[PDB]
């Protein structure tokens, strides 16, 4: 029995071990450097930030990953989605379940009108999952990011509520 | 021997488990996202806020739910009432007792002149419980709240103090 | 005419408007507020996104105030309030202000519904609201208290769907 | 041609001259020592205090006095009333009209159920004025205050809204 | 061996269980709602408030109740007295002992000139104890308070030092 | 005879008049509501924010508009560019020259690797101006913004430093 | 004449009075205090109820200062201090100020005793105090230090009972 | 082997037990009310106050009392001395030793020119102990303090440094 | 299996033992005085300072050293590198690995254009290790630092990113 | 002429100097700084002892700025920076300012070495520095970035020993 | 016709012009760099500092200099004395009279037991002036100060109150 | 194996027991009064004070004493030295070792030009050790200090780096 659960201070430990993994942050276009103190400080800082919602993906036993609906805009009604499953629990389908849960949350609870995301052009697995869920590649930002010593392009993908209610 | 009690900082745990349940908060038209840190922050924030009176409902042994009096207006002499009972204790009559005690408190302690509440038009159970306590439907708010991906209609039920002493 | 963002420099006018016993009765508001309290609340809710307070002005001077309050960004609803100075009454300012406010609420704030509370005895305001499409969705008996009497309130509202027709 | 207004910071000057007159403050049982700095500090400190409401009484041309509804209790619905007309405007009936308007404010706007006040027993003028407005003596506190070198007694007068509507 | 002992933070627990009892607060004209956090906040707030003195009545073993000399005025030399004995330890004479101790403290230590109190007109037991100690009913405030859904009158009683030194 | 300058507090007045024009802010997808107090607060809050750089565009005699390099990322080396020329100075080519100088600043001084921007799809004038400067459309975000009563689409245009040096 | 509540605007005068080597010697005080320090202490003790600082003024301008200090509300005693500008000396201002201060201390502050320290060599001040009923209750030898010498101090005092006779 | 020590935060406990005793504080003309929280607050408040030097008196095993040098004036070179010894250790000569050590500290460390103290005219024991140490009566303060419901007279005893070196 | 990690608050202990060693800090031209409290204060101070990237070097079991990237300039795209390895782990090749990982991080994560370092002209070991990694001597700073009572000369070694990709 | 302590009132000039694209290029600095940011940094580093910022002025008005920065009090070194307004170029102000700054650094701050970074292409500045005794101790290739190009930098320096000869 | 006065904020301007003259500050061994902002900050910071006393020396018409009694130790009763007469008022004897008045203040008002001062060994004028007032050299600190390019020596002169009363 | 080690908060305990010993502080001209709370407050206050450096002298086992390089001046390049060895560990030569270590630190690390100290004229042992290390009596401050009821003279001694490098 899996579930997405509001991120907690106590969970930051896991997230820390998740945010300092080069392999993971590279695909996320992030940096693999974030002291636990910095993570706790940002958690306290954005505690009441209504432009964010950070969920923890947990199965029947342990926490397996994290999802995040960030940059939530309540005028344009859109937000960015981003998932990170621990490499140890990869392949179990956690990513797809958590992605579906997050889309449902954004469309049926936050009353969003459009979800979007940034993915690496070479990361065909994530693009495959997204296109399976409904996201369409709306843009190719060439050399938009810089990771592993290379300027990487990125697909700006997105999914409209009108295309999900159908 | 059921009773109402003042919401304490230690009870937040229970309240947290209550505020992060999709099904429970759907009836309140509320969002089921709220970290324990956020709940504690809001508790310490409204500690002295006299416009609220949050209660814990507890039977002889455990805590079962939470009844709250909010938007307490001391000029117009009215306030909104909101009751929740943990689903695992449903059907045991705790909701009726909690609502009775809350009405008694609002009318005979806060010297309120009127009580009101918002209920989902489809929630026939809660509607019946409120009617049995004297509340009358004063208006139908169409598409007033957005939950489970749909704009739900809401009855604005209310009970005057004069209607209550009869 | 035009609606404008409420400015600190305007509070004076608002002050003169918020301490009038006749004007604030239609709002069910208490007609007491020092300029210092008004300035303190202005600074307090400067970044409060649940509020949008507008000044209504004509060719020359300021004539009134509008306010989109209790803006809920999940349910997509908000209360609207309008007050035109009595010295400018009957000139049609209230209707223009209400129209501009509805346009701002629906086409800029992306709202799904606009509601308001009006005194049951205030026939002129009820007619103005109905002419703009607002439909009474309830009657709150003895909801407010002003001039020593418990006044009932019509909860009027307008859906964005009923507005694009 | 005499109204009540909200007390403003700019008015404190006037009020200052009143709070330092021994003859005036004695009737209030107060101390005639209050620097303008202390007065401004108190004004700023009780700016948002809802248990108070200090009105300025002004005639057709100038400011003439101050009324005040203090200790406003929103549970028992009782407020104390105080009044001071500058000695130079005595005999023009300002006290009567200002007290009447303050009663009307306390009852018809603040929705209070009872107004009360303390009046020096030797001040028969104020007692007569209050009785004309419908106040009835409910007690005599003896040696309750100390001023002008002696423990002075005060009548606790009050008026119910029911007695006023008649 | 009984004694009144300066209220301590550690004692607040008891006081909390004492201040949330409807039966007790009703006669005290208070409200039976005060979270332990609110109580601790008010204790810290009024730690240096020289207008108060809150004693705990304790017998040879457990704490039995509380006394309070509040609204202490050092110009008029008067203060309000209020006692609350737990219903479990009622009838043991604790109230009379603590009342005598508090009067002695106010008159011989704080150098007060007059003690006073508010009691319910229907609470003949408290009035009996007070009149036994020396207090005389100086006023009847009609409908001064609101509790248990009714506007209750109250005796303003008081005792002068001149009537106690004799 | 047209230059860029650093945005100053004294200039906010001008900027204020721009941030409250619905017609101007619509193209930016912004809200035309920003009190001068809020604008000054934001200016002071982002004073030392290195992710921003707000330039004032002025001609030979007066101030005519504002350019801005925002979201300056010093890892991926990409910055968003925004421009507003007051409507009364339209048709004099100010937008072209100011945008050119801003490109030169972003590349030759901030050492940025790519500049990007969002432009309403219905605003063919801005698209033509940007294309003249070397920008190429990289994506079409559909129903990404909400203004003038509709979910409007925006082109994500951008320019690489390599394409610019040519 | 009149005593008045000390006001911030008066500190200038007080400053000119607190930096005079001759005046502050009768008080056993150091004649050094910047206007900034005086204003800071004014703001500090604004709400200090153990202090009551009065300005003494005649028909026209300010002439001196009085101070009821160390007010203990349990023992009902307080120290009194009086300083009249030398340019107004011999005009009888000190006696009026002392009288008004005693009246304020007994009939407004409900005090039981008023004490003061006076230099043993200051005969004029001792006579003024005795004329007002103050009786020497002790001699503090080498209590204070001024003008390079350890001066003794008479601790004079007056009971409210001895004042109502 | 008795000794004096600097008052520490941990000793406050003892001091608390000492400051809440009616009999002990009556000699000091002090009030026997002081919560431990208030004592700790005053300790942290005067931590750096150089006008005080509070000491703990301790014999070979336990703490027995407290001697204090207050109102230390560095211009006039004087200070008040106040000694207390727990009654259960009375008659054991601890007071004489503590007073000797305090005088030694005041004269030979703080370079004081004079020491003084207030004693109750009826307290013949303390008067004798002070006289045996060199203090002389310089004045009789009638009705200077109020304790046990009576205005007590006080001797102002003092000792000059010149009288002490003989 | 050696690795680099983000410096954490718990590691400061080790770092403290490292920063108070005369021999170790002499090579860095640093002073070997720094209380643990001071180190923790500096850590909490620069927690969000993006101009620094302090790393812990750890082998399969224990922590062995610390490599740091400081003075990170995002306009000129350069930063200083500073490596330390505990002497008890010297000669085990940890320094080479740490320097390689630090260069990789600086060039392939922070998108740096150049790395530089200050080394003692007499420290032939560190000079050789830096040369083997591609650094070249760009200048000799005579008497630039003062350690062990002598003004030492320092080589300013550096490595360009272009020289690194070959 | 004279060097003077930088004063808040001077920031205006400094502002006009710090937002010039041509001047700040010789410094490798970004030519962007609002007067508010400059005042905030002035207040921030008011007591920063690692900084000594001087105004260079002639008979009449201000003409430039000097700055002894990164002052290390253990190694006894510090960087020096000099900027003269272009409108006063060629008048010899830079040389006088540099001389006075070296004198201040060695004879007042007790420094052991004064270093600086200069653009390899800036021949005039290099000659001015060498005339004052500064000797190139290194060449930092592609150290700075300005006007779209990575510029190399000569790290010139002068020891106090080489200065007393 | 020359007196000492308390240093005022308005005087700082004058003092500023003094604290930036190399020739004047050299004798004090101070640095001639102090912005008016820093001077005002220090004045406000040491406003209540009792270890200082900065006097302004003024003649019959204008301000001419500054004296200062610093490092006032109230245990050892020693204070350092410093003086500066503006160079334009040299030769008029102001230094002598101001120093004399400062000595009188330190001894007869501050009850100090000894005054001390540091004077550059090359400044024979100041040494002569101090000797005329009764100061005697107690030591020669060699290379104790650094100014004008050299480690300068200073005489530590001082005067005892006993030597002064003679 | 002895060593000087940067003072730590945890060490304050020892230092406390060291700073309240009359025998020790007397020779140090200090006062034997410093609550542990005051010591901790001063430690936190001067944590970043670069004008100080407080070392703890510890042998192979326990902490034996403390050294302190205070009043460090980086313009004049001089500082005061002061050592305190516990009387229990006296005679073991700890003082000489720690003094040599501190002189080496001041001259070779802090790059000082001159160390100095104040010693009692009658304390021939400390003067002997100092003169053995190199310090020369540069001044005799007569009655500069006050301890044990007597005005004590003090040798101002000092040692130049030029006299130590030889």
mmCIF file with all atom_site columns, N, CA, C and O in Angstrom, chain J residues 125-139:
data_model
loop_
_atom_site.group_PDB
_atom_site.id
_atom_site.type_symbol
_atom_site.label_atom_id
_atom_site.label_alt_id
_atom_site.label_comp_id
_atom_site.label_asym_id
_atom_site.label_entity_id
_atom_site.label_seq_id
_atom_site.pdbx_PDB_ins_code
_atom_site.Cartn_x
_atom_site.Cartn_y
_atom_site.Cartn_z
_atom_site.occupancy
_atom_site.B_iso_or_equiv
_atom_site.pdbx_formal_charge
_atom_site.auth_seq_id
_atom_site.auth_comp_id
_atom_site.auth_asym_id
_atom_site.auth_atom_id
_atom_site.pdbx_PDB_model_num
ATOM 1  N N  . UNK J 1 125 ? 48.663 52.399 -16.703 1.00 0.00 ? 125 UNK J N  1
ATOM 2  C CA . UNK J 1 125 ? 48.595 52.053 -15.288 1.00 0.00 ? 125 UNK J CA 1
ATOM 3  C C  . UNK J 1 125 ? 49.806 51.233 -14.863 1.00 0.00 ? 125 UNK J C  1
ATOM 4  O O  . UNK J 1 125 ? 50.345 51.430 -13.768 1.00 0.00 ? 125 UNK J O  1
ATOM 5  N N  . UNK J 1 126 ? 50.248 50.306 -15.715 1.00 0.00 ? 126 UNK J N  1
ATOM 6  C CA . UNK J 1 126 ? 51.420 49.500 -15.387 1.00 0.00 ? 126 UNK J CA 1
ATOM 7  C C  . UNK J 1 126 ? 52.646 50.390 -15.231 1.00 0.00 ? 126 UNK J C  1
ATOM 8  O O  . UNK J 1 126 ? 53.451 50.209 -14.309 1.00 0.00 ? 126 UNK J O  1
ATOM 9  N N  . UNK J 1 127 ? 52.809 51.364 -16.129 1.00 0.00 ? 127 UNK J N  1
ATOM 10 C CA . UNK J 1 127 ? 53.943 52.275 -16.022 1.00 0.00 ? 127 UNK J CA 1
ATOM 11 C C  . UNK J 1 127 ? 53.851 53.125 -14.761 1.00 0.00 ? 127 UNK J C  1
ATOM 12 O O  . UNK J 1 127 ? 54.858 53.339 -14.075 1.00 0.00 ? 127 UNK J O  1
ATOM 13 N N  . UNK J 1 128 ? 52.656 53.629 -14.444 1.00 0.00 ? 128 UNK J N  1
ATOM 14 C CA . UNK J 1 128 ? 52.486 54.416 -13.225 1.00 0.00 ? 128 UNK J CA 1
ATOM 15 C C  . UNK J 1 128 ? 52.868 53.588 -12.005 1.00 0.00 ? 128 UNK J C  1
ATOM 16 O O  . UNK J 1 128 ? 53.552 54.073 -11.095 1.00 0.00 ? 128 UNK J O  1
ATOM 17 N N  . UNK J 1 129 ? 52.437 52.325 -11.968 1.00 0.00 ? 129 UNK J N  1
ATOM 18 C CA . UNK J 1 129 ? 52.743 51.473 -10.824 1.00 0.00 ? 129 UNK J CA 1
ATOM 19 C C  . UNK J 1 129 ? 54.236 51.180 -10.735 1.00 0.00 ? 129 UNK J C  1
ATOM 20 O O  . UNK J 1 129 ? 54.822 51.241 -9.648  1.00 0.00 ? 129 UNK J O  1
ATOM 21 N N  . UNK J 1 130 ? 54.871 50.861 -11.867 1.00 0.00 ? 130 UNK J N  1
ATOM 22 C CA . UNK J 1 130 ? 56.301 50.571 -11.852 1.00 0.00 ? 130 UNK J CA 1
ATOM 23 C C  . UNK J 1 130 ? 57.105 51.789 -11.415 1.00 0.00 ? 130 UNK J C  1
ATOM 24 O O  . UNK J 1 130 ? 58.066 51.665 -10.646 1.00 0.00 ? 130 UNK J O  1
ATOM 25 N N  . UNK J 1 131 ? 56.731 52.977 -11.898 1.00 0.00 ? 131 UNK J N  1
ATOM 26 C CA . UNK J 1 131 ? 57.404 54.195 -11.461 1.00 0.00 ? 131 UNK J CA 1
ATOM 27 C C  . UNK J 1 131 ? 57.366 54.338 -9.946  1.00 0.00 ? 131 UNK J C  1
ATOM 28 O O  . UNK J 1 131 ? 58.284 54.916 -9.353  1.00 0.00 ? 131 UNK J O  1
ATOM 29 N N  . UNK J 1 132 ? 56.322 53.819 -9.306  1.00 0.00 ? 132 UNK J N  1
ATOM 30 C CA . UNK J 1 132 ? 56.196 53.853 -7.856  1.00 0.00 ? 132 UNK J CA 1
ATOM 31 C C  . UNK J 1 132 ? 56.880 52.675 -7.175  1.00 0.00 ? 132 UNK J C  1
ATOM 32 O O  . UNK J 1 132 ? 56.788 52.549 -5.949  1.00 0.00 ? 132 UNK J O  1
ATOM 33 N N  . UNK J 1 133 ? 57.559 51.814 -7.933  1.00 0.00 ? 133 UNK J N  1
ATOM 34 C CA . UNK J 1 133 ? 58.319 50.717 -7.377  1.00 0.00 ? 133 UNK J CA 1
ATOM 35 C C  . UNK J 1 133 ? 57.653 49.361 -7.462  1.00 0.00 ? 133 UNK J C  1
ATOM 36 O O  . UNK J 1 133 ? 58.291 48.357 -7.123  1.00 0.00 ? 133 UNK J O  1
ATOM 37 N N  . UNK J 1 134 ? 56.399 49.297 -7.899  1.00 0.00 ? 134 UNK J N  1
ATOM 38 C CA . UNK J 1 134 ? 55.706 48.018 -7.988  1.00 0.00 ? 134 UNK J CA 1
ATOM 39 C C  . UNK J 1 134 ? 56.339 47.148 -9.067  1.00 0.00 ? 134 UNK J C  1
ATOM 40 O O  . UNK J 1 134 ? 56.610 47.615 -10.177 1.00 0.00 ? 134 UNK J O  1
ATOM 41 N N  . UNK J 1 135 ? 56.571 45.881 -8.736  1.00 0.00 ? 135 UNK J N  1
ATOM 42 C CA . UNK J 1 135 ? 57.221 44.932 -9.629  1.00 0.00 ? 135 UNK J CA 1
ATOM 43 C C  . UNK J 1 135 ? 56.282 43.764 -9.889  1.00 0.00 ? 135 UNK J C  1
ATOM 44 O O  . UNK J 1 135 ? 55.725 43.188 -8.949  1.00 0.00 ? 135 UNK J O  1
ATOM 45 N N  . UNK J 1 136 ? 56.110 43.421 -11.162 1.00 0.00 ? 136 UNK J N  1
ATOM 46 C CA . UNK J 1 136 ? 55.236 42.318 -11.536 1.00 0.00 ? 136 UNK J CA 1
ATOM 47 C C  . UNK J 1 136 ? 55.747 41.015 -10.935 1.00 0.00 ? 136 UNK J C  1
ATOM 48 O O  . UNK J 1 136 ? 56.890 40.616 -11.179 1.00 0.00 ? 136 UNK J O  1
ATOM 49 N N  . UNK J 1 137 ? 54.897 40.355 -10.150 1.00 0.00 ? 137 UNK J N  1
ATOM 50 C CA . UNK J 1 137 ? 55.225 39.072 -9.548  1.00 0.00 ? 137 UNK J CA 1
ATOM 51 C C  . UNK J 1 137 ? 54.496 37.904 -10.199 1.00 0.00 ? 137 UNK J C  1
ATOM 52 O O  . UNK J 1 137 ? 54.648 36.766 -9.742  1.00 0.00 ? 137 UNK J O  1
ATOM 53 N N  . UNK J 1 138 ? 53.715 38.147 -11.244 1.00 0.00 ? 138 UNK J N  1
ATOM 54 C CA . UNK J 1 138 ? 53.012 37.066 -11.907 1.00 0.00 ? 138 UNK J CA 1
ATOM 55 C C  . UNK J 1 138 ? 52.087 37.597 -12.975 1.00 0.00 ? 138 UNK J C  1
ATOM 56 O O  . UNK J 1 138 ? 51.789 38.793 -13.046 1.00 0.00 ? 138 UNK J O  1
ATOM 57 N N  . UNK J 1 139 ? 51.633 36.670 -13.818 1.00 0.00 ? 139 UNK J N  1
ATOM 58 C CA . UNK J 1 139 ? 50.688 36.961 -14.893 1.00 0.00 ? 139 UNK J CA 1
ATOM 59 C C  . UNK J 1 139 ? 49.547 35.958 -14.792 1.00 0.00 ? 139 UNK J C  1
ATOM 60 O O  . UNK J 1 139 ? 49.742 34.765 -15.048 1.00 0.00 ? 139 UNK J O  1
#
